[PDB]
């Protein structure tokens, strides 16, 4: 049942699709922001969300949402990833720039397994929708509802799989079991980012920019 | 002969004298800004440096300079720390903040050792300028000028020491040697500062809004 629909979530993914390796993600911050903000309002039941909680959820989901995406995009290529910046990173470069570690976990833990199951855009979008509706998010004005939008998505997602793919009766669960992978890679990335800042140039303590 | 008069550095020190435990350091940013910069201008020849260098040195020294100040300030206090903003801090209180690790060192490697040598404002000021005139800072248009200025500050400070205490023939080296202690205490704060933003998460990836 589509008290929370699916082919629309596909449409959603389709809307936002695009028709030195570190910097490129720190280039495009504006675009990712573009991509990410629109996609959320195109999620059924998403905008009806209090404006404040709309926020928490984008803030909280930012990394994963954004990682899930390029992972699924690089199904298309052996040996690398393809960023929304219309550029494409390589194992040798990333390594050479000291993020080989994060690079490898993405291909081994996210791309290859997404390939191996030949995941599609309804699936992708549906996982994302899950990530977006996160009840454990800090300071949700109404959280005990947000669980429902999630409850409501995965359900619908059981079906799409159940019909399109009844030979595999646990493909669904196989799908959910990539979420832990996605967290952990989400925090690993965050760790690197904090590290690089830290061994960063004297322009390391510029936090003073909070300033209030 | 002198042309980095100790009297001037004294005048500068004096000019800036002040006239949740953790969270209270952070919002003080604006007054610290004023206190660092009004102090710096009053060091001879600092203003002669290309303006673009001036920014770096301060940016660079921000930490150590602040830390050097409050440490001295608290040679009054007992097993505590006094901040430019007037709030005292105690070990039980700090450790109930995880900054116990800084606190210990501040006290046992700076606050107490200054208490010990009855370190004075001229001396402190001089070490402070030495910290400021830090030619290892990145992007200096001309590392060498800073080198020279640094060298004068410590030349006069040597001469000062000898004069005022001809008996203590080590006070000058004693002083210089408070410096690695001070440099590492600074990084240790950044390590906390960083681990806090990180682990706290809550509002953790607010790195966006770096040109975002």
């Amino acid at each position: 049942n589509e008290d929370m629909p699916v082919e629309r979530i596909l449409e959603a993914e389709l809307a936002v699709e695009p028709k030195d390796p570190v910097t490129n993600i720190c280039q495009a911050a504006d675009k990712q922001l573009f991509t990410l903000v629109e996609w959320a309002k195109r999620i059924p039941h998403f905008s009806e969300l209090p404006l404040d909680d709309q926020v928490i959820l984008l803030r909280a989901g930012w990394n994963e949402l954004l990682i899930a995406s390029f992972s699924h995009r690089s199904i298309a290529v052996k040996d690398g990833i393809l960023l929304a910046t219309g550029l494409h990173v390589h194992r040798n470069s990333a390594h050479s720039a000291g993020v080989g570690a994060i690079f490898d976990r993405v291909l081994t833990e996210l791309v290859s397994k997404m390939r191996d199951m030949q995941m599609d855009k309804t699936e992708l979008g549906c996982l994302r929708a899950i990530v977006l509706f996160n009840p454990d998010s800090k300071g949700l004005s109404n959280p005990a509802e947000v669980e429902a939008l999630r409850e409501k998505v995965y359900a619908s997602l059981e079906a799409y799989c159940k019909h399109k793919y009844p030979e595999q009766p646990g493909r669904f669960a196989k799908l959910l079991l990539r979420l832990p992978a996605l967290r952990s890679i989400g925090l690993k990335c965050l760790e690197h980012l904090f590290f690089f800042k830290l061994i960063g140039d004297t322009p390391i303590d510029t936090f003073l920019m909070e300033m209030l | 002969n002198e042309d980095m008069p100790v009297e001037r550095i004294l005048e500068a020190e004096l000019a800036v004298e002040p006239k949740d435990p953790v969270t209270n350091i952070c919002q003080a940013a604006d007054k610290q800004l004023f206190t660092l910069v009004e102090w710096a201008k009053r060091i001879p020849h600092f203003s002669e440096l290309p303006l673009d260098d001036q920014v770096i040195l301060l940016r660079a020294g921000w930490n150590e300079l602040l830390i050097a100040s409050f440490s001295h300030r608290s040679i009054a206090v007992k097993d505590g720390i006094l901040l430019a903003t007037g709030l005292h801090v105690h070990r039980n209180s700090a450790h109930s903040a995880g900054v116990g690790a800084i606190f210990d060192r501040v006290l046992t490697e700076l606050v107490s050792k200054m208490r010990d040598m009855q370190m004075d404002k001229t001396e402190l000021g001089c070490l402070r300028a030495i910290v400021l005139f830090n030619p290892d800072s990145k992007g200096l248009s001309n590392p060498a000028e800073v080198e020279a200025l640094r060298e004068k500050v410590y030349a006069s400070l040597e001469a000062y020491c000898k004069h005022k205490y001809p008996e203590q023939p080590g006070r000058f080296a004693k002083l210089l040697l408070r410096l690695p202690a001070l440099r590492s205490i600074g990084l240790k704060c950044l390590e906390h500062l960083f681990f806090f933003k990180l682990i706290g998460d809550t509002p953790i990836d607010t790195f966006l809004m770096e040109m975002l």
Partner: peptide
């Protein structure tokens, strides 16, 4: 304040 930026896109 990052909120602001998002909100301004959220409309």
């Amino acid at each position: 304040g990052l909120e602001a930026i998002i909100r301004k896109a959220l409309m």
